[PDB]
Design a protein around this ligand. Structure first.
Ligand SMILES: Cc1cc2nc3c(=O)[nH]c(=O)nc-3n(C[C@H](O)[C@H](O)[C@@H](O)COP(=O)(O)OP(=O)(O)OC[C@H]3O[C@@H](n4cnc5c(N)ncnc54)[C@H](O)[C@@H]3O)c2cc1C
Ligand code: HEM
Ligand code: HEM
Ligand code: HEM
Ligand code: HEM
Ligand SMILES: O=C(O)/C=C/C(=O)O
Ligand code: NA
Length: 568
């Protein structure tokens, strides 16, 4: 057969997958995926039949309920979603090579005829607020507006939920929490504010950083009340004390937080629509929001009538063409992001009158795996690992800010470096076992053997770790001034991960005030329009601190939903 439907119709009727009249149920293909499951079982049941030692197409780190049609189309060949970041040996029936080529908002102006027909029709739905984006900020806004009495519709352009938020690892920053007190840590919102402004080179808007520090504990409390585990508290770069909260044992914070938000949305019966892209914010004759035009992949264009729209579409770090026009030093670099993080949300905000700010400030994460092409958490360094070059020496304070750490690594021989750690560091952070499972953390029982395996001077490496452990014992790094030295690298076996910088976060975006309202270039509010999360600018200034984006998306998403519900 040439496609999956052709295979099935040799022995089945059309109504085995379709509704009685044949129309597609909705853009999430709810009815159709329910029929796949009726014969094959749930995704976890299918996964029992497709196990590999270290990977499985049907049992991954993605949260929520991943629809079968995310990867299996019926009437045409289709792509494996995991191929956008990995290259596992798969043999999916009727597959084609991964390729993402989404039309821009400007190119969609070519659908003049279909769009005018949709806008001439009745609105498909009439609600109070529409939220665009199913990342951490969007789910937070949808839940808080619903809890404040508003009727919401939440839309997502991709086939799966979570955006970049589901990939987060290192933690969520907050001060002075009950969780910090239980681990004997002393902190304050004032200290988090001061670290944040200094880390951003004082470019941040101080009123928005005051919202970030002062609401941080309340956001950790709100997530914990909904069922999240934020009890493990570690250190990230540029922080005075440990404040990055994540699950017990050092597991990833992102997939966990997104799964909690999704379960809480399902409990409240929130209308969530996949494969549905927001295209154009609609405004009335007085300049206030009246609704939004959307494009469903399977059902086409339609509009929703509403008093408020909350844009929560994330950043644009996957789009290297746009990144290079703003910061040419990052042209041609690989990215840590999901395939849809290209900035179309910024285009929608500008078309509605919103102004942008700080667009030139873009962050490279210092440690992407050279072998796997995926981000390696900064929590590996925070829990104790060091960085060495090909000559086997340390060369930088490993917990400095990301701008300085990326530059340092690029200055070394081969433009890459190695994370080095032992079993004491491995057992303190369970996320490290995920890098061992991916095959990007080679190990040996001596540093001479490990240096030979990877191309690092072995004698120098051995001497480097001995000296570092001596610095840890005395309490002061006289070589690179690293201010926190948590563990000596001397238990069990040794591990190396080859790393280099990659494009990771865009600190600029739509201009918002402290109530999350979007403003134009004259600094006037656009009534009914809100923004929250990485789509906004002014919170992180010239360099974001690790742990501060998960904090931002919960705080500003929650505030935007409450403000939009009150606006009504
Ligand atoms: C690998 C990785 C690890 C990270 N680790 C951490 C961590 O440990 N700590 C931390 O502080 N931050 C971390 N970050 C940053 C953090 O995950 C991001 O800032 C993300 O949390 C921002 O969330 P968001 O809700 O604004 O956007 P996202 O989570 O990116 O979600 C936005 C959603 O909007 C959808 N969308 C876009 N345009 C449209 C449209 N027109 N119509 C409909 N839907 C649309 C996108 O497809 C996406 O699903 C990490 C980022 C990455 C990529
Ligand atoms: C979009 C919906 C569905 C998806 C994604 C899906 C998935 C698949 C795939 C990937 C195959 C393997 C094809 C090949 O070997 O070339 C398959 C085969 C098969 N499917 Fe489906 N399926 C769907 C709907 C259904 C339904 C509704 C039924 C039953 C009424 C069904 C019953 C079967 C059977 C009997 C086989 C042959 C192998 C076996 O006996 O398990 N499928 N399906
Ligand atoms: C001869 C039998 C069938 C007929 C006549 C038929 C008809 C159609 C049509 C006309 C569409 C597009 C509708 C639109 O654009 O609005 C469609 C899409 C679709 N059909 Fe079928 N269908 C048949 C069998 C099946 C089978 C056996 C399956 C599943 C195994 C299936 C699953 C789907 C799905 C998931 C879609 C959405 C797009 C895609 O994945 O290709 N159909 N079908
Ligand atoms: C419940 C939802 C789904 C069903 C019922 C389904 C069905 C199937 C079936 C019947 C097979 C063939 C297994 C065999 O050889 O015995 C298969 C293979 C495969 N499917 Fe799915 N699928 C689902 C969701 C997905 C999703 C979401 C993805 C991608 C993330 C995916 C990607 C693949 C791949 C890559 C293979 C080949 C696996 C390998 O080579 O190890 N499927 N699927
Ligand atoms: C359904 C699709 C996918 C599958 C089956 C898959 C599979 C895996 C596997 C087997 C690992 C090693 C650790 C583990 O066993 O969980 C891993 C790690 C990782 N994957 Fe994926 N992956 C998928 C999609 C993606 C995509 C699209 C991205 C990036 C946007 C991504 C980003 C990462 C990262 C950053 C890691 C490092 C470890 C961690 O952060 O937990 N994955 N993945
Ligand atoms: O886990 C990391 O390294 C990412 C943290 C962040 O981008 O804030
Ligand atoms: Na931003």
């Amino acid at each position: 057969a040439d496609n999956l439907a052709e295979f099935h119709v040799q022995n089945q009727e059309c109504d085995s997958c379709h509704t009685p009249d044949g129309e597609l149920s909705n853009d999430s293909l709810t009815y159709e995926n329910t029929q796949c499951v009726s014969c094959h079982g749930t995704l976890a049941e299918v996964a029992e039949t497709t196990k590999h030692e270290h990977y499985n197409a049907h049992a991954s780190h993605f949260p929520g309920e991943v629809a079968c049609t995310s990867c299996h189309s019926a009437h045409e060949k289709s792509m494996v979603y995991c191929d956008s970041c990995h290259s596992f040996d798969f043999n999916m029936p009727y597959a084609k090579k991964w390729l993402r080529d989404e039309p821009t908002i400007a190119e969609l102006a070519k659908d003049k005829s279909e769009r005018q027909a949709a806008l001439a029709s009745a609105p498909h739905d009439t609600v109070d607020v529409v939220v665009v984006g199913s990342g951490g900020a969007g789910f937070s806004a949808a839940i808080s507006a619903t809890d404040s009495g508003a009727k919401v519709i939440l839309i997502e352009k991709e086939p799966v939920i979570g955006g970049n938020a589901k990939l987060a690892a290192g933690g969520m920053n907050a001060a002075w929490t009950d969780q910090q007190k239980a681990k004997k840590i002393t902190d304050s919102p004032e200290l988090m504010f001061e670290d944040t402004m200094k880390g951003g080179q004082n470019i941040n808007d101080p009123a928005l950083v005051k919202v970030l520090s002062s609401h941080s504990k309340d956001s950790v409390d709100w997530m914990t009340a909904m069922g999240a585990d934020l009890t493990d508290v570690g250190m990230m770069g540029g922080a005075s004390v440990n404040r990055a909260h994540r699950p017990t044992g050092g597991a990833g914070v992102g997939a966990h937080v997104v799964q909690v938000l999704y379960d809480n949305a399902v409990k409240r019966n929130i209308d969530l629509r996949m494969n549905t892209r927001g295209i154009e914010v609609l405004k009335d004759d007085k300049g206030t929001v009246k609704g939004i035009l959307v494009k469903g992949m399977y059902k086409g264009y339609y509009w929703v009538k509403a008093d408020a729209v909350i844009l929560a579409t994330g950043g644009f770090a996957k789009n290297n063409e746009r990144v290079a026009k703003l910061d040419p030093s990052l042209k041609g670099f690989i990215s840590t992001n999901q395939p849809g993080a290209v900035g179309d949300g910024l285009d929608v905000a500008e078309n509605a009158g919103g102004a942008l700010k700080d667009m030139q400030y873009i962050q490279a994460h210092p440690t992407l795996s050279v072998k796997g092409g995926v981000m390696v958490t900064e929590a590996v360094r925070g829990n104790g690992a060091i960085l060495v070059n090909r000559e086997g020496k340390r060369f930088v304070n490993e917990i400095t800010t990301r701008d300085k750490a990326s530059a340092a690594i690029l200055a070394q021989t081969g433009k890459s470096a190695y994370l080095i750690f032992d079993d004491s560091v491995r057992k303190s952070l369970s996320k490290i076992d995920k890098y061992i499972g991916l095959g990007v953390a080679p190990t040996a029982d001596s540093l001479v053997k490990l240096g030979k395996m990877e191309g690092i001077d072995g004698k120098a490496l051995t001497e480097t770790v001995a000296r570092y452990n001596s610095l840890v014992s005395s309490g002061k790094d006289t070589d690179f001034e690293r201010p926190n030295l948590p563990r000596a690298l001397n238990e069990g076996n040794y591990y190396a991960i080859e790393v280099t910088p990659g494009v990771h976060a865009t600190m600029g975006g739509v201009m918002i005030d402290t109530k999350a309202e979007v403003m134009n270039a004259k600094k006037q509010v656009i009534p009914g329009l809100y923004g929250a999360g990485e789509v906004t600018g002014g919170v992180h200034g010239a360099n974001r601190l690790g742990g501060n984006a998960i904090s931002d998306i919960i705080t500003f998403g929650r505030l935007a939903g409450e403000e939009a519900a009150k606006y009504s």
